[PDB]
Amino acid sequence: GSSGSSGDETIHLERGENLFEIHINKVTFSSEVLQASGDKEPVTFCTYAFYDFELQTTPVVRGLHPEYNFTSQYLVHVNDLFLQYIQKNTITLEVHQAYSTEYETIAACQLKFHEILEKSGRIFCTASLIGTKGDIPNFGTVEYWFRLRVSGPSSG
Template sequence: MSSDKVEFEHKLERQAQLLDARTAKITKLEGQLRDIAYGTKTYTFKPDLKGEDEANVFDEAVQLERGENLLELQIVGATLSPPALQVLGDGEPSTFCTYSFYLFEPHSTPVVTGRRPRYGFTSKYVVSMDEHFMDYLHR
């Protein structure tokens, strides 16, 4: 009976160590999640550009307050179908895109000419992760 008691105590001690390790891991992950979700860290934006745009790359540090995140919307390009080109009546039309997001001012891309316009436009918004914004995203 005493050997069973010693074995049980060792097993209990090992399980307590495993629980402590799991608790430490959960606490660490919760901290990382909090940093990401509530914007408590400063992130450096490094665009993924190729070719001639590489010369224009610069580091842009964004200062975020607690509860804020950086959201980026990027319009890369478009493809105009043959029926759309017919409606426009131009084989090489000049086009641009406009859009509105949440409570921010409307944005527009530069004017680009061609059947497959490449806008390469990114807009950045610092948003507060509150109930109203989350509801907007959900809708």
């Protein structure tokens, strides 16, 4: 076969299994967070749960702009209850700082996909981060992408 730059437009996918994968590139910070850090490779980690499944802990890494390079996927069968869920409730991914002594949260955002409501697939999107205490509206932006298509097996 072949692959490359392409597009897809559809409302409801065919009758088959659906695989929801989520690959997080990395997490950028703002001039404020960069300095606020402490001139020391800041270590943080994110977490989230889909379809009320087992929560997954992101890979801890030191640095300013690490590459989690984490790719999670699970074969889930659901369409109607799927879209409704996206609305009824969204995903909450907070970013807490993991210290070598204690652990506390300093940021919290709401992960939700709008396009998924109409379209389905590689829909580029982003989310903003806000500081809980510091109250920093320019904490940083997260780079992620979602996809929902028939993960049914094929002959080939």
